[PDB]
Amino acid sequence: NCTSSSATVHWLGDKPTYHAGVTFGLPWPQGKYRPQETSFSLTGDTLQSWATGYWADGSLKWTAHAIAESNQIYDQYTVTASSLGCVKSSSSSSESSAPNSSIVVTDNSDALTVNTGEVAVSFPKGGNVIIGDIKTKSGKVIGANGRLVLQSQDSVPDNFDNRANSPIQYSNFDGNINEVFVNQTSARTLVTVRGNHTVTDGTDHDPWLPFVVRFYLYANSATIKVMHSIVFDGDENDFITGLGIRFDVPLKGEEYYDRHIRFAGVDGGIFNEAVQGITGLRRDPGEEIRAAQFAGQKLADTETWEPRVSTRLKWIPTWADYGLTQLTADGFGLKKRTKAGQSWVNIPSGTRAEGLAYLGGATQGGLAVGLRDFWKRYPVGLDISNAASDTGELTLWLYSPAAEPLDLRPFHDGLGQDGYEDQLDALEITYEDWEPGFDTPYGIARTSEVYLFAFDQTPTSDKLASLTAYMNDPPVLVAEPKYIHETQALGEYWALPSASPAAATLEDRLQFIFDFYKGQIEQRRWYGFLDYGDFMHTYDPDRHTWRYDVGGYAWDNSELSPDLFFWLYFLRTGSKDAYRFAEALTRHTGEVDVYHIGDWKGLGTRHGVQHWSDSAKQARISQPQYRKYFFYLSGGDERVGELLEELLDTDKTYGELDPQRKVRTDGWEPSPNSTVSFGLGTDWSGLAAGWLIEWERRGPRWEEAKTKLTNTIAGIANLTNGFVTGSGLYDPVTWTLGPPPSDPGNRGNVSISHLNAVFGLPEVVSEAIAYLADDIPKGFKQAWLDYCYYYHASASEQKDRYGVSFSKISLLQAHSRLAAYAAYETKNKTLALRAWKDFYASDGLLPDAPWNITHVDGSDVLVPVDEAAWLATNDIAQYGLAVIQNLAYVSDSLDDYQSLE
Amino acid sequence: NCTSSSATVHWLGDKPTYHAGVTFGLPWPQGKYRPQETSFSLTLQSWATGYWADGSLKWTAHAIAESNQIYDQYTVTASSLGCSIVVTDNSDALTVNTGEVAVSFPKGGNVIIGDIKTKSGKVIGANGRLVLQSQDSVPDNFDNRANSPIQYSNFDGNINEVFVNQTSARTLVTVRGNHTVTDGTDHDPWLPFVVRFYLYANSATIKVMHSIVFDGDENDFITGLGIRFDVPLKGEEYYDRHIRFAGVDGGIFNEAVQGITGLRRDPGEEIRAAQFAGQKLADTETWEPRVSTRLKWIPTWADYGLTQLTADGFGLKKRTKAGQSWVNIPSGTRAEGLAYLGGATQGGLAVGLRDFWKRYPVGLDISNAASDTGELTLWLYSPAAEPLDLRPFHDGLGQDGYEDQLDALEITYEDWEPGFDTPYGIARTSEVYLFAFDQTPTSDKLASLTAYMNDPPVLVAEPKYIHETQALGEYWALPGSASPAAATLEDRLQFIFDFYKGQIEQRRWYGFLDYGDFMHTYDPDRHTWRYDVGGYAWDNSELSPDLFFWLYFLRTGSKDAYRFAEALTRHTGEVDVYHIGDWKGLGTRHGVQHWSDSAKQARISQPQYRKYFFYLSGGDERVGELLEELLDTDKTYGELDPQRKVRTDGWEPSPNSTVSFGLGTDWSGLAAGWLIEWERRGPRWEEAKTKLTNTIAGIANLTNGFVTGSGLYDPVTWTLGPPPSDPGNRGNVSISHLNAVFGLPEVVSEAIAYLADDIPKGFKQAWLDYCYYYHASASEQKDRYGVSFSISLLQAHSRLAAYAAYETKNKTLALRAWKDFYASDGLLPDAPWNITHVDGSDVLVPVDEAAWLATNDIAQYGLAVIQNLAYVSDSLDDYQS
């Protein structure tokens, strides 16, 4: 019979003044709603839907929803779910109403056309043009031949002087379409276009730099959201110099004085000009003619002016090109010229441009284009070309050619390092684990969030400033935290913020950590095309800088799961700032810090001076768990969907590359057609998170992932030392897990690492135990409980059980949460107290650490900066997770712990 | 018998923390002191810079050594008659030795500083060389670079002449030359240069005036311009080699070639703190051995580069060596543009550019710091920037001949012509500083030296004294108000100053060539100054802003005021004037580019504009040089007619043939130039004296005086006769509003006073008549001259009435001067007299505006206030009636 329930959803911060349609996710409790048998309705104070994840029983876990662009914006949106037996025992009569707007698509051998009711855009199925043309509802074309432009060069001169004696061969490229896909729905439609960049001008060069561009169009919207994603293919010789998206804007028929150029400036500023300026001449055509051009309206017929002006328009210059370059994160330049062959006139410019340009006119219409977080991702640009011609160009440079070309080559030569002993010895001084030919960016990726806007006529500047604001803070709808928690669709291991004054200062200290790391991004200028979203790993208290030049201490690359902390922090709080911080991080770490092709497809690169410089290529960085939260909140963002699917191939890498090669003291080395060795902590937490997720989404490979997950859970269980076992051997035909090389026949092996639990293990393990339910392999849960308990048992408790004590245990604050979990699962108050003692005593960040920032200025530093010095990113990340998880599992013990002193 | 007096001299603003030797100037009264006989003491190195008519001292200049002891004031006593650096000559190169540093300058070759030694004898840097890179075309757009590759060419500075003005306290080394190719496509020598090195006793800072004259084709695009040194560091260990960069507002960046801080293992807290402080690291045996072994594994960083390519942002980066990627370094907004390379034991050098970010694109490179020899490079124009493109900004838009050209002038206020859109012969001067160090200095010192170069302390006379000597005109006085009406005038002058000082920042009027100028008229609809409409963009000294801002300094003493007037003069005197070629000595009319207009005219180069700075600086040798160039201005009147377009007449110019001079518009700029050389007693002073006195008597023996609009000048006889509209001199009347507003009243007042009793009969009266009759009734202008006029900038010209009022003791005239001031054109007293702030989506960035004014109005408003107060401030109380 009938089952129905509601969940509410809220704007991430303040209520928007404009949105362009929006997708959101909603969790649902285990077993409540069958797929295909569940309708969903929208209440806005007074619904397009689909599934993104499922429970082990097959019921709905997460769904995504989509609402059209709308004048009417509410403070909150309430979805109601209804089982199908809810309307198949009804005897009432609903009106079936038509939506006021609804998407339609036409299909053809040549092209694919999506009509929202405000625009219609065509997507060629082949060739060197992504978007064929863009029409308003009028029918008129406002822009056309959207194409991807790449430019490269085959070498770099040693320095500026070397230019005269070092030839650079420049080469241009076009986006070649290979595949076009579609997700049609009435409320929004997603066109996914995969491709390749191919030569146009300059030297013949294999096609390269694969792409996939996603176009989101919503009913009733003239706004297209564009998720441009490129994987890097090149080698020592392919230096990128220009990367961008370009449109023709047809202006023929428009008087020059009716053609309009707008660039977004600083803080909701807009730059307002026309191709032929009528304002500030020696003579005046009339107050209202001038006001009108400034406003972007069609100017009165020539006959009504003062004739002093109309007769001499042949002598007023005519500005064909405009250029805006943002080459540092703190200043941009702006210039125009009359045409090629003449010098540019410099325009008064400023600090940080919000990254939108418009080209068009009062009659012919036109389009605006922009990049989200424009200046934060320098070097970038905005070009207008040939605006005094029949067809204008409008270009967004994701990488400005006015910048130095993008050099991805190694930052050093090896410093003489010959083989592992030397490499390991460098590790001891710089924390860098170098290896020859491993400092490579081959396979890394980056996504960019572009927006397109179509106009029937030049819009007001206020509209342009609004769309600019919009683009840079795209409205998000999210589930209430309390509801996400009750559903348990996203972990047992966190809960909301208790009366303990101890607990209250913990919350303050998580806020402190967050406020600090948010501010540092600005202060240390962790900005730029590849860099933005990451932060650094450790500080230099002498120089007052993050150790950007000392091997492993530089870019943090998700070391010790800061990604879990900041996402868990967002879940618990619903803070806008927190989501944005984690959004940015997840777009960096998932794209730039992991390999998407090549022999290492599915491994990421350990923390280093470059995001790819270190040899340790491991699954703990690619760690799918770090993406799960943002995948599901957000309505199954299809890019991350793809990234998660890519990771299913990670097990294949342990045949090509063993992460322990340099330290493994057994015989082992991978060989062909043969069981492969990986870790049970670091490596297996990566593998399992990915398998769990494929199973959850019921994607192409879900059975397989279910098998690999369940068999390895059984293999660890059957290993007589469980996780404490060093870490075993995996068969890539049978999908099973045996004991390691140093112990065939499972007699008992012991290898402990402070790193095994801190890259997702407890989080994946808890979800896996929860998902598998009654089908869980016998005594796997005991083995996990074992690891959790013996890790900071006494040395004699360890020797008793496993044969030897664990001398090299550290990160005791970090592992406090493993006791906390065990304390909850066994209902043991003493084990609970141990979690808190390890949290508050032991290591990491102690409660009596400074817990403040120092300001540093004058001649000590380049710029004024705030600093810790007493903390490092490893510290805060595990602290943060310790606070959250110990509070989830054992808050009932915290005042008890506190009252004993 | 003794004549003795004292004059005191004060810092510009606050007492400086540090100076590196200073030259200042003092005026003296007409007839007080003879040149070789007068001696000067302090509480002193001295020379004459200008003189009065009878040969007595007018302006002196003085130098003091660098001193740890610094005073609030310095008092110079002069007494009438009846009352340390070491230079050495090898047959090869010359060394100046201040006591603290010792610099060798070759007399030829492509190296300009041979070596720099500290007082111990250690060579801290060597091979000072001028550097230049160019390219031969630019692409149309970025896509065009595949199909149109381009020929780069490196050059360096070849020396031709070297001069030495040597004195005990100060020693100026001048080095002329040009840029002579090395690597890249063959190319003739070009880009003539001059580098003046000032060295003072007991200083290791060297001030460096690097001037350049652009003399290339449409095909010469400059991609890089700079000064470069070698820094030795052979003995020094990688972790004892230190790199600094000035950052933002007191900031310094502090690294080392091989860093020992931030490592996985600590060598020692004391060690780590020492590298950070630029000290020699204790013996490696005293380190933690986990760090001292394994030093091999810590990378060395040879190459550092700071690029400042906008006024609001710099990037900073580091590289192990070539063939590896750079690593980006946390950076910021506006770097103050000093770099240091050197070591704890081997010593080093710092270079920088005054006003660095304000003159973008600039850069600082350090290179090969992990090698036997390092390179340290100031880039006055940075390679990381787009090439410097001085070609014209339009193609002519199909203008053909003077009828079209004057038809465009009516809508865009631009007078174009083909071939006149040319930067050939413009110049630019950069103020660079070198600093020599026996060992890596403290970061605190580096910051102090950075602070110093960006605000070089200046020593100036008291305003009461300057005015009292009358050695810079009688046409201004100190503020000290008596009426509330005068007080409001003062407050309005600060309003004008604060607003313009503001707009430089707000409208980013910065850059290599731009910084120092401002713009002409405002577009009130776009809320932008009119940067893109012909003659409404860069002001290029129109209506004598330079006169207003310099006179505003004289009156007040304001540091801000001097600094503004200075930056202006460094622009207008250099990039707005031509220094070589056929137009040498003329400047370009206000435009979109500084050189785009076809009206090349002496009203713009007007030597009066540079006179106040020339003396107050203590004889700035570069402004001195520029003032000599302007003595050739007359030659151009046989090579270009300013009226070639506005002529229903047939006339044309040839060399040594007679020409028409407008008596304000052409003659006052020439008289200015001639009056200055006579005052200085320069190489052409006899020439100058006769050209001035001839033409001054010329104008007196015209029947109608200045009222006769113009004259006819013989280049052969150096004399001035009636205009071709009235040979035989029965009488002419021609009046232009343009004649008084470009320094005419200033030159005439000064000349009358200069000549004294040797003034030609009836010159002063011919002037008073212009001053009286310009805006008298047409009943008073027919009743003499027989043909009543047809008066157009009454506020501006109110000054003239006031001069005549002072001189005639005529209270009717003074009140008319105040009526014309307060109640006609220009800035009326009822005008808004406030700013409007503008933001949101109307503009790119937020701005304050005053659309009710334009630069022409403030320039002439400011002169009228200053001048009317000086001459007729008694008559101001009475005008309130």
Ligand SMILES: [Ca+2]
């Ligand atoms: Ca990274």
Ligand SMILES: [Ca+2]
């Ligand atoms: Ca100028």
